[PDB]
Amino acid sequence: GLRRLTIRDLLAQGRTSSNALEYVREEVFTNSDITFSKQTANVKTIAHWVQASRQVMDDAPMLQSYINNRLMYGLALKEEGQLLNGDGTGDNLEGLNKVATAYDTSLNATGDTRADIIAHAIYQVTESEFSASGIVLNPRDWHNIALLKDNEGRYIFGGPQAFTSNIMWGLPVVPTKAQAAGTFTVGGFDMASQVWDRMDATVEVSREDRDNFVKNMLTILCEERLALAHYRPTAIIKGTFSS
Amino acid sequence: GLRRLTIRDLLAQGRTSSNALEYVREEVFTNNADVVAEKALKPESDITFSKQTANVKTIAHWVQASRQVMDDAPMLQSYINNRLMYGLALKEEGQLLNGDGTGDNLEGLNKVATAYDTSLNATGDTRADIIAHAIYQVTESEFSASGIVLNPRDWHNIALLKDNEGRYIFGGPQAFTSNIMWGLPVVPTKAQAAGTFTVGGFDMASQVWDRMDATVEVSREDRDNFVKNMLTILCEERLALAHYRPTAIIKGTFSS
Amino acid sequence: SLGSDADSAGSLIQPMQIPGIIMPGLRRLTIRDLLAQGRTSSNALEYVREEVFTNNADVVAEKALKPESDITFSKQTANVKTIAHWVQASRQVMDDAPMLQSYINNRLMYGLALKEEGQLLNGDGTGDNLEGLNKVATAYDTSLNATGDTRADIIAHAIYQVTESEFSASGIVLNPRDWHNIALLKDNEGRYIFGGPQAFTSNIMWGLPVVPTKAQAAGTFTVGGFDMASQVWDRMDATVEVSREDRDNFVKNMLTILCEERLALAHYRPTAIIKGTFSS
Amino acid sequence: SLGSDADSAGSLIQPMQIPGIIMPGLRRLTIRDLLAQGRTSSNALEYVREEVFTNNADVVAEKALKPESDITFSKQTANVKTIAHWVQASRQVMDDAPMLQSYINNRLMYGLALKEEGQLLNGDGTGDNLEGLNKVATAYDTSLNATGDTRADIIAHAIYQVTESEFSASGIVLNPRDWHNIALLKDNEGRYIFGGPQAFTSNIMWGLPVVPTKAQAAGTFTVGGFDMASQVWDRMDATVEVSREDRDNFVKNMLTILCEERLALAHYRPTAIIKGTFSS
Amino acid sequence: SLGSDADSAGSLIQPMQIPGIIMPGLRRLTIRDLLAQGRTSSNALEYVREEVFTNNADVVAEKALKPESDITFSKQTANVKTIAHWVQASRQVMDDAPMLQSYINNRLMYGLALKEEGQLLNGDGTGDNLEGLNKVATAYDTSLNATGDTRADIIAHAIYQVTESEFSASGIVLNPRDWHNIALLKDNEGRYIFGGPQAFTSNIMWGLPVVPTKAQAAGTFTVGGFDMASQVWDRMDATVEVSREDRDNFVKNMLTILCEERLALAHYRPTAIIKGTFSS
Amino acid sequence: SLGSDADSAGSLIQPMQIPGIIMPGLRRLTIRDLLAQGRTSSNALEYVREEVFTNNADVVAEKALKPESDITFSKQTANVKTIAHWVQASRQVMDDAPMLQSYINNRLMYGLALKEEGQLLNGDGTGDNLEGLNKVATAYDTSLNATGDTRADIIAHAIYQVTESEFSASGIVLNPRDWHNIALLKDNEGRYIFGGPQAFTSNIMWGLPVVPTKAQAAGTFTVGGFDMASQVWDRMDATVEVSREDRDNFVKNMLTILCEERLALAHYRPTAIIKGTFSS
Amino acid sequence: SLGSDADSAGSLIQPMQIPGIIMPGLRRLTIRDLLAQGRTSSNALEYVREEVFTNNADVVAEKALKPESDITFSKQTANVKTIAHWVQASRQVMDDAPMLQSYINNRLMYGLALKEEGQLLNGDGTGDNLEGLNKVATAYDTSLNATGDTRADIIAHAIYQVTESEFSASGIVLNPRDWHNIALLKDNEGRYIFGGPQAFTSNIMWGLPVVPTKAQAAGTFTVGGFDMASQVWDRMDATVEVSREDRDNFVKNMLTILCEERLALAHYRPTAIIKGTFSS
């Protein structure tokens, strides 16, 4: 139960019972002539296998459930990768960084901070008739941000005194390793683009496999298949952290 | 009802449960029975036998598709299955008719079959005229012919034969011609090479023994499969073709 | 002098009215009756059809590795197209002639289904047009023709080519004139091949029902297992709606009658449909 | 010598009178029977038919203007014409020969009904004349004639040309001589197509009844679905009344016999009738 | 040697007498039975037929003067002719041969009736000879003969020419010699038209009974509706009388036997009969 | 070695006797059964037939000379002849073999009946030979032969020639070989005239029964109304007598067996019988 | 690896035994059934047949010497021949395979009867061989062959040649090879005289049953009234005896099996049988 917000939580969560989806996007708008497109959201599968030995698995029931939890987390980290930097090609999901609108460099003021850039992006969200939801950053990057000071010494963000959790400008922050070193993403995930769960994360095992049966090893797997849809590609903005 | 007149139906269908089959056939009957002069020595006749064996060969094939497509699309699940059956049964004839006899290939009909008599061909004969000749050559074993095997292409142009008057031989355009020739059923198989034909008393000259019926099985956890979240489909079958009377089958070439 | 012409008292005589209206030759609808019918509720239909079956099934040695054979099908999509037309009539006429509308309705439904049949058969496939049977159809095998064949032989040949995919042909589609010039065939001695002068032959050839529709172009023919290979999907049945508030109708006492219908044509086994041209 | 010669005693023997008058050949009247028969009490008939159906129904693109179809109509009129003739006879002849009265009647009735048939088939349409079946009938399409067709094939073709308007033919009308030469056709062997010398063939070909009438000009043939294509309307049946006060009649002791009739021929579907000419 | 020789004892043996005179072939009478029969007791007959019927029944315009039709009549006469012949025999032969007269009687009747039939058919018409069927009969239409017609076709053509009078035929008169070659006709294959060698065809052709008579000249044929085209009127039946005092018979010791008959052939409808000649 | 050879113990086994004697082919008599079987008691027969009937019956003008007709007769004779043969056998043999007597009788009758039938058909008509059918028969008409006539056509013609005497035919006489080559006739197409190879045709032709007899010479045919055109008169039925005292039979210890018969063939109507030669 | 071959656990699985033995093609015995099956008990047979019947029956003149006829006879003999063969097998084989005894019996019979039929048909006649039908039969008359005859025609001719002995035929004997090429005869058009690719024709020709056996030589053929022209006499039926003491069979632990039979073929009427050759 890692106390950290997930990119999965940022989006709306619903259920489905189909191969793919016939939903409709939104391209441009010259404020008139608006643009729309009937897209397909394919339900691709994701998971990662882990094989040990039956000599250990049968000699510890507590360790049984343990691995199940260690993999559920290991999956989310990979699931987070398919959602964010999702290629959207073969067996990859329609990623955010791929569909996201680029950052507007013309919003930078000579003399501001690293965090100021983030605030500027939050504004571009309104330029799509939508309300912002959250921020996705790289742990290392987000770290340097929380630890900022001025030319004199005072803390930019704020002292540890009245400190809390992961928020910025009143928005949830998800420090993921899936986010490239020096890249960021902001959007109105709450009502913009959502994910539909076809099959929840379940776990099964098999003594007979590639080798296993002859090696006495047992294979564990956490399979989960879902679909990612993008209603408003304008409501999302990805930008390069210039430094 | 698309009964393409299964080549199997033309043969005796029996079930087995062993590795192979062993039958006994009379090889050479030295018949010396003749007229005998009074108070003289008589003719000595002899008989030869042989233990002919018919091995049980296995035929099958497999496919591997993503599970996210099979368990997700049920009506397609059974589609691939029914297609592999057709695909297998199609190659089944391929052996029964053109078996090499060597190695694992079954001793097919054409392999065993006695060659056609090139002399029976008279000046100015039709293609169907020849098949008629074949039916006779089958009689050289004292057995009524049972069926005729032909390539759909050849058989097609057969039913469309005409007299020097103009009318059709097998049937006026008003109705389609039924697969029959000289009272014998006809089997159009792509397995039968063009220009080649097979005739004989299949009804009781050769028998097919089924050790295992054509079955289809799936493996959720075969080697890679579990990881690749796939599935392996298998359609197998175990046969055994026995040839009692080789002289009761003919193979020839449509020299035209 | 007191005649019946205009000059005289002919005004007193009123011609007898013939109750009813005269409709022209009402063509008998077919084609869609040959195909499988099904109802849908989507803007389109994503399906798949077996393209290439690589059969590798063979005799396997004991303890040996089995043959791998795969089936490659292409993912074709059948879009839902809309066919319709409207008539702008005077409201004065509609009220003065009661049963007029009832006529127009049964008249537009016909004109609709007519141009519908025209699509299912010769669908361009380009843009809004459907992928008609003749577009999808696999070309005729010219190598099947032999020295001294009749037009009847050709169809017979085609019927076989349908078996190349292994599917019994449902029927034969021909232009009424071609079908005619076929029923009237004679042998090299004179006798009639079909029915003789005594009586006309039925619309059956090689045990298969013959469909003569003016929809089929002259010199063109189509054979296949229609009742199996292709299916029609009715999104919206043919219906007629009337509105006098359309555009500036209310302001001009006009009545706009609309006759629409939504379709969708699919082709599961295209290999089972043959098309050709009679060389003359 | 006392012979039966004129210039002798042959004046006492009076030739035996054979009771009865010898009428010529009475043509079996038809045509009027092929058509539908109705009655009227007016002087003309008005019926309506669909003139031009401008069907523009086609595939429509999403968010686009649809095709506008149009329809045209017409008021077709069939006037009532009067056919008749009179005969002036001496009162002496009529009184001295009693049977004559009823004879002339049964003759004028025939003579009248003869020209009646003569109109229905070949009506000039010139003012007073009725628009006969031939003046109306759609001309035969020469394009149907193939290479090496018998006169029998031509009719078979004509029958079809009727179907080209979605209408079933009723019968075939030809000149007796033509029908003859037709029934006596032979193949390249010698056999009779309709019937070997054993017996004459029935008046039927291609499933349709054949009607040989001297009223039909030689080399001319008319095929069509008369039972549902045209209709005859009787205003006044053939009546015969006599009067001996007509002008001079009384003063010349004459007798005038009249035989009149009123008709009206309507042609609903002219497309369902075909006229043509054989190739000599 | 006491044999049965003439110069020996072969005089006591008397050859056995075979009773009954051997009469030759009796030609089966037919022509007489074909025509309708009736009798009279006068010198001649007078029947009246409609000559020229001027039919002007046409379409009359309103308020206009109608057409005038006329009917002409003619008086036709049929004279009674006498047929007979006598035999001058010897009284010696008559008394010495009792059953002789009885024989001659039943012999002269046939001999006379033979000429009776011979007259009814080929009646010259000139002088005292009757106007037989062949003279009255309307000549055959050479125009009806088409290229490639058999003798069987010609007769079939004639049957039609009879229909030009609105009267159906009832018989075909042919010379046995010709009727034979007709029944033995073959096609290109070689098969018999009327019947294979297995059995002989009945005397029927085109549904009409065939009458083969030696009275019909070779190469000549006659067809028509005899049962209603002509009628034979008998004034006096065939009678036989003998005279012992005829001329010098009393002195020469002779006996004359007479056999006479009085006929009268009427031809009501000449257009219902046809005479023709085979050109080959 | 005690074998059953001649020079050994074989002289002990007596060959089994096969009861009965093997008689050769017993020919089926026919000719005699075709005629009338009457019996006489004299050495000759005298019948009378009408020779020349000069029939001059014609139409006679009023008060004019009538025609004279004359008749002629003739006495035709038919002598009775005798057929017989004897066999001189050993009196000893007759006693040693009892069944021989009865056998010789039955064999002498057949032997006689053969030369009897041989006479009835081909009687030379000379000194002692009877006037056989073929000698009397009126020669076939060489004119009845047309272009391309089968051998079967000829007999068909012959049958007609019999009718030229107003008499119906009874049967046909042919040599078995000729009859054979006739049943095996084919048409220009190759088919069999009488019957397909599936079954041998019955002995009937043109409705008349066929009679194949080896007595009929090769290439000679006879047709007519035998049932009543000629008749056989039996003076003495065929009988067998035996004499022991005949000549030196008593001294040579012999036995003479005699088999005789007395026949008389009469030919009433020669015009009803036809003989001809198969020119080929 | 645990396979199922020699080097592995294949010795554990026993092949399934198929019940009994597979006898080769058993020819259908026919000839023996075509003849009269008589019973005897002697060494030979003596039948008497009439040789030369010098029939000189003729017409004899009055008081003249008569014709002398003579008859000749002969004693024909039919010897009884013996057919058989033996087979000595190991005592072991017999006891170890019970089914064998009864099998060998059935085989020696078919083997004997086979050479039996081979004698009856083509019996040499010399030495100990029987006088087979073919060596007795009268040769086919080449004269009967006409220009353009089929093989089927010739057989028809043979059937007649049988009649030339006053005896009706029984059946036809041909080598299946030749018989085959006959059923496949076509006319000048191309149609099968017997079949017509729908059904194989039955073994019947010219009303007579056909008998195709490999016993008959290729090109050779026989026709006649078998069921009356000849007779088979059985002295000893086909019996099978077993001896265990035959010579040294006791010491060698052997066992001899014999299968003997005694026959005698008689040829009553050789004239009723025909043999020939198909020159082509």
From Swiss-Prot, chain B:
Cellular compartment(s): Virion
Result of changing residue 235 to S: No loss in the ability to form cross-links
Top-rank taxon, per record: Viruses
Cross-link Isoaspartyl lysine isopeptide (Asn-Lys) (interchain with K-169) residue location(s): 229
Location in chain, cross-link Isoaspartyl lysine isopeptide (Lys-Asn) (interchain with N-356): 42
Cleaved signal peptide residues: none
Annotated phenotype, changing residue 229 to D: Loss of cleavage and cross-linking
Name the record gives this protein: Major capsid protein
The organism of origin for this protein: Enterobacteria phage HK97 (Bacteriophage HK97)
